[PDB]
UniProtKB/TrEMBL annotation, chains A, C, E:
<feature type="binding site">
    <location>
        <position position="106"/>
    </location>
    <ligand>
        <name>ATP</name>
    </ligand>
</feature>
<keyword id="KW-0479">Metal-binding</keyword>
<feature type="binding site">
    <location>
        <position position="103"/>
    </location>
    <ligand>
        <name>ATP</name>
    </ligand>
</feature>
<dbReference type="GO" id="GO:0008817">
    <property type="term" value="F:corrinoid adenosyltransferase activity"/>
</dbReference>
<feature type="binding site">
    <location>
        <position position="131"/>
    </location>
    <ligand>
        <name>Mg(2+)</name>
    </ligand>
</feature>
<protein>
    <recommendedName>
        <fullName>Cobalamin adenosyltransferase</fullName>
        <ecNumber>2.5.1.-</ecNumber>
    </recommendedName>
</protein>
<keyword id="KW-0547">Nucleotide-binding</keyword>
<comment type="subunit">
    <text>Homotrimer.</text>
</comment>
<dbReference type="GO" id="GO:0005524">
    <property type="term" value="F:ATP binding"/>
</dbReference>
From TrEMBL, chains B, D, F:
<feature type="binding site">
    <location>
        <position position="60"/>
    </location>
    <ligand>
        <name>Ca(2+) 3</name>
    </ligand>
</feature>
<feature type="binding site">
    <location>
        <position position="2"/>
    </location>
    <ligand>
        <name>Ca(2+) 1</name>
    </ligand>
</feature>
<keyword id="KW-0106">Calcium</keyword>
<dbReference type="Pfam" id="PF12723">
    <property type="entry name" value="DUF3809"/>
</dbReference>
<keyword id="KW-0479">Metal-binding</keyword>
<feature type="binding site">
    <location>
        <position position="4"/>
    </location>
    <ligand>
        <name>Ca(2+) 2</name>
    </ligand>
</feature>
<dbReference type="GO" id="GO:0046872">
    <property type="term" value="F:metal ion binding"/>
</dbReference>
<protein>
    <recommendedName>
        <fullName>DUF3809 domain-containing protein</fullName>
    </recommendedName>
</protein>
<feature type="binding site">
    <location>
        <position position="131"/>
    </location>
    <ligand>
        <name>Ca(2+) 1</name>
    </ligand>
</feature>
Length: 152, 148, 152, 148, 152, 148
């Protein structure tokens, strides 16, 4: 029960972290690269918290940093004019894949918290991360001299 | 500067009890975290959320909401506070159905008082505060429920 | 229950759409690019149908278009001589990844329809899409001057 | 993050009255401004200073000080508060002499909780808060004095 | 029941095989390429075993070959000095993604074996494969002239 | 030269039965595969794992472990065997909880006796042996359980 709920959440966080590793193999703005690399460390710690009982690693400071990046990068982009389709420059497309895998991990983390006592920080972290990856995708399309893919 | 949360929970004692639970704040919010100084006179509910920023530390943003009794449960409807300092509007709706099935929806809005680099620290911090309280609500509401 | 069944299906369609975005970042035959881009819009609408109750978006016209692309691209390829292994040119390999993620989404859509009233169009759409992505992979290997990877 | 103020004032009713005035906070601080929520139990005095920053608005920093009765008057000696949020240490010394001549000295220290651009807004704001209260003290202390 | 347990396991093995196809589209050391290509055939056979009742395909010989590759590549790398974060050269990053998808397939295979009679070879195969993909990631970072990404 | 496995299983007959099951090897290991010649006198358990190499074929590596009864279940603690031939240390811990929920953890270590190219064949083969037995344990332990 818990192993499936717990082992699955750990695996999805791992998968997400690996997808971010693929994104990091692409050319990126120095600031974006710094944020993503730091996030990888956060995810490593997050996985450890999900695994070990009585052990916590994600704090308000982690959440605050994500909130800061969201405000920052968003204030560096023009307002959203229409629904966006995942895609664009390769970097942006990968960021969107990371976004969807992060949401997948969030679902597993939420499921885990429903069957076992878990702090709220982990789900709050990936909730913010999904939003940030969406924002970073837009930043990467921008940085590539291109634009977001719009829908009908 | 907004956060939303919605969820369902079953009251172990059935419908009448679920209606009573959602209609009395002191019951429904007994185990709710991140709402400091929570209090009520039966008519309104009030308290504060804490936004942590550097150097100032924990900055308290008050809220005050009207309790509205409805046919299937109750709501909180936010009152407007002054612009002299940042505040929060806390809204919520709750229904109790057959068998004690309860549905909740909560909405939070931070209202800032009216330099560019600094605004970034306050917006991010306030956003984190709103999400922390919103994300913990299901846990908090569940903590108020008694055993069958 | 429904949220897990429904939220999960929506997420997998989103993940699939994102993987297609990655494929679109690669060099492609103009016709293939046009089909894939249109599919992204279809998937956006499909996700909306899965999400909103009483709302439908996928029609026979969508299915017909997929059927048309299948017939078209297949009649542009030589007959299958043996089981194929996913791989080849990078484009073809990515198409195969899209194929498997599409099948994953189909499983989630089928699960959703089992616990909630849902039109048949969504699963029929991704059923066809999985087959089309397989075909497009072969087209991309062909277009790259290479050939499909065969098994023992 | 510090502010100091020193000044002299004559109590119109002479020495005994000046001693009594400086030894009772409710008397000495009756007309003092910029110390919100001022209260005392005779042993300690407490309240808060307001630091105004954008978006959060007025952020209250508490202080609490011990009242110490001395041979020529009284002092306030600050108590340490927690690091969870910014606070203030309020110190003061007062003496009453022959003829009702009174001397006052007050010291304030803001203690911040432990991004570079933002720190600049908080330090500047807290500095302004400390100076405003310090600079207004002579006016405030004088407002508490009765006529001959 | 079995279809979900079985169809899901088959799909994850397929997804893993497809991710390996993406890795194979990258420049690789000839030896690494040979191992990965052979593994694709193994995974095709593995999927067939999971699908058909009374049919087996994975043997001790398959496990032995993986054990051999693990010993080989590991004795070609320096000892692990600290926890590694998935990433580095693009090839290494993709290998890590393959690693996590392989672990995902292992979870599904384990679930399947819990609800239906299944030989132990399939799970033992992917258990080893996950470890090998981790090792190959290190080999690829090495071959790229780079190093593994370390954590705090 | 090490392999580990951990997993949980529910005993259909509840706690007392789960305790009895984990404390008696002949019960717990009845359906366990890849442990050839398994036997026990109630005090220790012993058997052999098979390492397959070319030309020699199946080479048997013995193990022998002490059975230790604990408050929540039982353990196997490995005994040291001679260095004349390769052997295996088999360790395990099992607990039974409320409702018959059982937790297992097993650890295996191959101990080799003390040419470079050949060592590669033996290490790889022994590694495969350890993993095969470890990976099949959940299946084996589950095969020993009766129906409700």
């Amino acid at each position: 029960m818990g192993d499936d709920a717990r082992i699955a959440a750990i695996g999805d966080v791992d998968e997400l972290n690996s997808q971010i590793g693929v994104l990091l193999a692409e050319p990126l703005p120095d600031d974006v690269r710094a944020a993503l690399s730091a996030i990888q460390h956060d995810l490593f710690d997050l996985g450890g918290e999900l695994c070990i009982p009585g052990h916590a690693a994600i704090t308000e400071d982690h959440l605050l940093r994500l909130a800061l990046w969201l405000v920052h990068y968003n204030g560096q982009l023009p307002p959203l004019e229409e629904f966006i389709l995942p895609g664009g420059a390769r970097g942006a497309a990968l960021a969107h894949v990371c976004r969807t895998v992060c949401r997948r991990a969030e679902r597993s983390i939420k499921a885990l918290g429903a069957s076992e006592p878990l702090n709220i920080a982990p789900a709050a972290y990936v909730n913010l991360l999904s939003d940030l990856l969406f924002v970073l995708a837009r930043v990467l399309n921008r940085a590539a001299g291109g634009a977001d893919v719009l829908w009908d | 500067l907004s956060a939303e949360q919605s969820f369902t929970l079953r009251h172990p004692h059935g419908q009448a009890a679920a209606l009573a639970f959602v209609r009395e704040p002191a019951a429904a919010l007994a185990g709710v975290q991140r709402l400091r100084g929570l209090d009520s006179d039966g008519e309104q509910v009030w308290g504060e959320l804490l936004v942590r920023v550097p150097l100032l530390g924990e900055v308290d943003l008050p809220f005050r909401s009207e309790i509205v009794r409805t046919p299937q449960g109750a709501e909180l409807r936010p009152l407007t506070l002054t612009g002299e300092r940042a505040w929060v509007a806390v809204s919520g709706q709750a229904t109790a159905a057959e068998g004690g099935e309860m549905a909740f929806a909560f909405q939070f809005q931070a209202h800032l008082a009216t330099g560019a680099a600094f605004e970034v620290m306050v917006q991010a911090a306030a956003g984190v505060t709103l999400l922390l309280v919103a994300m913990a609500l299901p846990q908090g509401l569940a903590a108020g429920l008694p055993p069958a």
